[PDB]
Amino acid sequence: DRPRFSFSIAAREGKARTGTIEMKRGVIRTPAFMPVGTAATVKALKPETVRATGADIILGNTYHLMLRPGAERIAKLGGLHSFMGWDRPILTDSGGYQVMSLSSLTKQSEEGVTFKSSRHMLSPERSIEIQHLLGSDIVMAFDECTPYPATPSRAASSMERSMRWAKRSRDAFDSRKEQAENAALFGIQQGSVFENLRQQSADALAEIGFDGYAVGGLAVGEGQDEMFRVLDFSVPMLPDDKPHYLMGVGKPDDIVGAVERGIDMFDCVLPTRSGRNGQAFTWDGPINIRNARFSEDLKPLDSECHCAVCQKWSRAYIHHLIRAGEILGAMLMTEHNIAFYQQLMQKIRDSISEGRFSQFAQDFRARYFA
Amino acid sequence: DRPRFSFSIAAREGKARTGTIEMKRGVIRTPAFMPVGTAATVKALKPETVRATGADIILGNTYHLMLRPGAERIAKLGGLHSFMGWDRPILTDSGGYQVMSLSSLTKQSEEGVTFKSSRHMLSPERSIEIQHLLGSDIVMAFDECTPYPATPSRAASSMERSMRWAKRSRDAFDSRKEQAENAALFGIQQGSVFENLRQQSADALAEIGFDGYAVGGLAVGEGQDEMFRVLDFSVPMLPDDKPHYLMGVGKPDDIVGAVERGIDMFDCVLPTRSGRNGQAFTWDGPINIRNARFSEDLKPLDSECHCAVCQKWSRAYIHHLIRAGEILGAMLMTEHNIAFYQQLMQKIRDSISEGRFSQFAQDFRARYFA
Ligand SMILES: CO[C@@H]1O[C@H](CNc2nc3cc4c(=O)[nH]c(N)nc4cc3[nH]2)[C@H]2OC(C)(C)O[C@@H]12
Ligand SMILES: CO[C@@H]1O[C@H](CNc2nc3cc4c(=O)[nH]c(N)nc4cc3[nH]2)[C@H]2OC(C)(C)O[C@@H]12
Ligand SMILES: [Cl-]
Ligand SMILES: [Cl-]
Numbered sequence A, B: 001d002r003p004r005f006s007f008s009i010a011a012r013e014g015k016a017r018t019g020t021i022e023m024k025r026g027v028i029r030t031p032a033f034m035p036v037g038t039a040a041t042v043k044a045l046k047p048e049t050v051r052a053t054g055a056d057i058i059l060g061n062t063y064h065l066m067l068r069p070g071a072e073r074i075a076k077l078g079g080l081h082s083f084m085g086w087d088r089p090i091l092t093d094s095g096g097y098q099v100m101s102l103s104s105l106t107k108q109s110e111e112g113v114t115f116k117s118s119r120h121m122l123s124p125e126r127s128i129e130i131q132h133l134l135g136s137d138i139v140m141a142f143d144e145c146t147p148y149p150a151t152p153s154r155a156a157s158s159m160e161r162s163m164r165w166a167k168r169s170r171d172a173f174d175s176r177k178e179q180a181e182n183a184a185l186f187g188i189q190q191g192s193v194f195e196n197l198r199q200q201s202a203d204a205l206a207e208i209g210f211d212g213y214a215v216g217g218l219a220v221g222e223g224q225d226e227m228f229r230v231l232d233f234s235v236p237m238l239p240d241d242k243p244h245y246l247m248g249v250g251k252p253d254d255i256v257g258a259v260e261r262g263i264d265m266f267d268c269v270l271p272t273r274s275g276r277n278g279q280a281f282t283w284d285g286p287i288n289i290r291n292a293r294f295s296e297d298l299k300p301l302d303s304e305c306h307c308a309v310c311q312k313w314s315r316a317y318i319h320h321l322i323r324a325g326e327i328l329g330a331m332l333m334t335e336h337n338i339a340f341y342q343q344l345m346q347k348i349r350d351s352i353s354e355g356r357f358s359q360f361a362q363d364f365r366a367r368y369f370a
């Protein structure tokens, strides 16, 4: 049987790595893309369809599930896996992004954050407890995603609080024997765009010790050049032998460049949300299927994609569905986009395994941006 | 290979019949329920899911497809079957219901009906032509669904016009060799609730001659007792050896009673539309999954249903999805309701075949209304 957690690196090229995370509920191939399932559903897809696209793990969210349907309720019903019908690993974010994005609803203190719609509290202890009640496989420490831009002083204060909360998260997780024995805990690096703060954060997290390390505080409006600059110095600060998770990233070219910088795991709403809005990803760049130029286009969304949508339906049909507001349009766009993302990850994994990832990245960019 | 059209009756009990319609694109088991796919999609279902529930044929609509995406456009793209990915029979309504339901947008004459949003015209000739461009397998005559209630004079005038339009529909269909050789044409009986007008309409349609006969002008607000009273005298007026199609019906108990009165084919938006609104059909009657009493109910939607939804997900999960407005909620409710309708039709067919349909109808009603 599989261990609680084992990360193995099978091949490397520069800073890029490919390998596997073995957990009780399944194996995760890395670099990995996690479809987002915030409301206990990957929007518009059955779990079997999510799996058919190639996903090994999905993301849930402590904050949203705490509000609806409720964490204690999900536990009473048998846990999130049973509830939604996904039996493979689930990573749950801790609520630390909503500490920032919904800050106007919040009162923040050293103890935690109270959200006001009804009031709901989050803290390191309560976040870890909720993730236990959900039955999460990868538990995220409770942090604050520092707003961007941030002054050095405020970035430091925020990061320091997050590191104190990381230790509280570690202790809460370890004090719950069933959780400690069956789940994994990842810490989240903060420090905004500042190298010295990123180093202090990495050092604090490594001293505490985690099963994996997320780069937090990015995909907050900084743009790709700046994100890549921060990754250039931040990822090498993390323990090499544990997974590196870039939260909330991103577009296909963001993912490729982040893998080139040592990232192993990703999640993003882009394929699902923008799919419902009519944006389809292709190897020649994104297209907006609503555009009148697709009304009589019999080609599939993408000329090479192996997904079930591209095997059966035309751009013209999907154009009609999205223009009409039909649910099947959301379903088909979403399945294709998630399948495209998984095929991207597979090409990344294969190219690293074969020592040709740098060439893949160059070929990918030349065609995607042509 | 299958014929253009052959209806065979394999077994009978009272006025009820069970059998098959063989067409080039497939066999239709009768009594049959046709899921509605007005916008070239059965809402929230892939065609493979529609088929997996047991459907042999689906319904499309001349009026809606004429407007969006356009009939000529669908023909240029290869026809409705290819466009939407359903390769089995499709019956298309002619637009005659919209002649009534959208009458405020219309100018009506003996020639046809002009609809004003852009203006679009329908006539016997244009309706049959559109159904040809779509590649419909069962073409409906262009009629008027008489409003309810109607005075005897107005019901007679409307029915008489519909019979003139039925002859024009027949001639238009026959004058298009590819359509006449590969599709079937059904006539539509009118006459409101009046026995003498229903008889005149049946006589006119039988004199023209059609492959099947619909009972039009019902499911227009008259209620079940009155609908059944009209069916009692109207269905025996139609040729016994051709299918009898009750347009727009209906709730499960409407279907059972209509089969008891000699109906072979049905279509209704109830399972799809009310499913999206949270109503699930069960053998113990409908339930509204939004109700708080389902928030922690781990049972499936229905305790006996064989559908994939009832094999995997709980009422509690589907309650959460529908309350949250999640697309997967619409998908799961719709699949279950269509599967329930198909299981109803299968039980009807089997019970007629075994000479126990009267007992089935009594047992069904006793439990459904308990
Ligand atoms: C849904 O928003 C869009 O998708 C990206 C999300 N960006 C992002 N950053 C994150 C950072 C953290 C963090 O520091 N801590 C914790 N606990 N969770 C995090 C989660 C994060 N999700 C954004 O990218 C754009 C700007 C394109 O749209 C946004
Ligand atoms: C979507 O409305 C609901 O579903 C039922 C539809 N009823 C109905 N009757 C029809 C009659 C004709 C006809 O005479 N000619 C032609 N060409 N097509 C027809 C189509 C018909 N569809 C209604 O039933 C209720 C009232 C429950 O809601 C309505
Ligand atoms: Cl999303
Ligand atoms: Cl519907």
Ligand SMILES: [Zn+2]
Pocket (backbone or CB within 6 Å): A301, A302, A305, A306, A307, A308, A309, A310, A311, A336, A337, A339, A340
């Ligand atoms: Zn595809």
Ligand SMILES: [Zn+2]
Pocket (backbone or CB within 6 Å): B301, B302, B305, B306, B307, B308, B309, B310, B311, B336, B337, B339, B340
């Ligand atoms: Zn079911």
